[PDB]
Amino acid sequence: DDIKVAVVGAMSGPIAQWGIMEFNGAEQAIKDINAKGGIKGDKLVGVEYDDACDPKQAVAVANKIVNDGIKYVIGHLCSSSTQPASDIYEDEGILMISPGATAPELTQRGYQHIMRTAGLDSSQGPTAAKYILETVKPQRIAIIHDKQQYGEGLARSVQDGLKAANANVVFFDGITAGEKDFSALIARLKKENIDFVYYGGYYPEMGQMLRQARSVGLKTQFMGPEGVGNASLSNIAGDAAEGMLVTMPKRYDQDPANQGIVDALKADKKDPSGPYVWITYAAVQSLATALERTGSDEPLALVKDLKANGANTVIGPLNWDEKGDLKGFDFGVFQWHADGSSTKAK
To answer: Domain of 281: which CATH number?
Structure first.
C-alpha cells in the first residue's frame, strides 16, 4: 500500500550533475502524485541508487534491486550502465524505464520489459528535413558531415528525407574532422552557389566553417544537429554563429503547463532547466499512473497498457512502439545567436 520504485543514476562520479537532474525530476514526480491521492490510495516511495554511471556498478546495482524485491526501475542515466542492467532486469521480470539512455540497441533485442522516455538521436534527421522543406524552402542545398557514425548518420537521413520530396541537393560530401581550413569547401559553396548547408557533426567544425564562410561573404544559411548547439560555438564563431539553425530538445521548462513544477523546483533551490528533470518526471508519471492505475502489480501487464494506450506527460503525449521506443517523438528547431542564446524557430 506503499509501492516501491527504484531510481538509479549517477549521484556520484563526474556525471553526477546529470544524475542530480533526474533524481530531482523523479522526487518532484512521486510527490506531486502521492499528493493527489497516489495510486488508488497507495503511495509511491523512491528507493535511490548510485550507478556512478559505471558498467560494473550498474550490474551490481541491478542485482541488489532484484534480490531486494523491487519490481519497477526508473533508470539508468547512461547508455553504458543501462545495457548491462537491462539484461538483468528482463531476465528476472522487472520493469525498466530509461529517462536518459539513447543507444539504439537497448531496444534491438526483444526484451519485453524495457521502455524509454528518451528520444533517439536519429529522430533529429527527420525534424530537420521537414523544417527545411516546410519553412526554409531553400533553392540549392549542399549536405556535409564529418565521416563519423553521428554526423554521417544524421546527414544521410536528411539527404534521404530531402530527395524523397524532390528537393534540390547540389552535392553530398564529407570533411576531415580535425581540419582547420575549409577554404576548398567554402570555395565550393561559393561556386555551386549554395544557400543552405545541413552539416552533421560537432561544434568544433561548425564554428570554423561559420567563421570561415562569413569572412569570405557567403550568405549561405547553416543547419546542424544537437552536436553544434554548444557553449563554445560562440566563443568560436563569434558573430558568424548568428542565425545558425540547430535541432535541440524542446524546453519543457517553458511550457505554460509546467510552470507549477518549475516554481516547485526553484523553491527547493533546484534548477528546472535540465532536460533530465523533464524526461525522468515523464517516466514516473507513465509507470505510475498511466499504468499502475491499471490495477496490476505485474511488470508485464504494465508495459502492455503503456504500449497499448499512452502516457499523458509533462513532455507531451507519449506513444511507444512494440519494442519500447517512443513513436512520434520530436526535437525542436532553434535559431542561434552571437551571444550563445537561442530562440525557438519559425
So the answer is: 3.40.50.2300
Contact in structure between 42 and 3 (CB atoms under 8 Å): yes
Residue carrying C-alpha cell 530538445: 249
Helix, strand or coil for residue 133?
Answer: helix
Q: Compute the distance between CA of residue 207 and CA of residue 198 in angstroms, rounded to an integer.
A: 14
Strand boundaries in 125-282, DSSP class E: 141-145, 169-174, 196-200, 221-224, 245-248
Residues 242 and 280 in one domain: no
| Count of domains observed in the chain | 2
Question: In whole angstroms, what is the distance from residue 323 CA to residue 326 CA?
Answer: 9
Which residues precede gaps in the chain, with C-N > 2.5 A? none
Q: Which domain holds residue 227?
A: 121-249+331-346
What are the cell numbers at 44?
509511491
Neighbours of 183 (CB within 10 A): 9
Query: Rounded to an integer, what distance in angstroms lies between the CA atom of residue 181 and that of residue 262?
Result: 44
The reply to whether 210 and 337 lie within a common domain is yes
DSSP string, 27-38: HHHHHHHHHTTT
Residue 172 is classified by DSSP as E
Could you tell me if 220 and 336 lie in one domain? Answer: yes
Per DSSP, what are the bridge partners of residue 108?
Answer: none
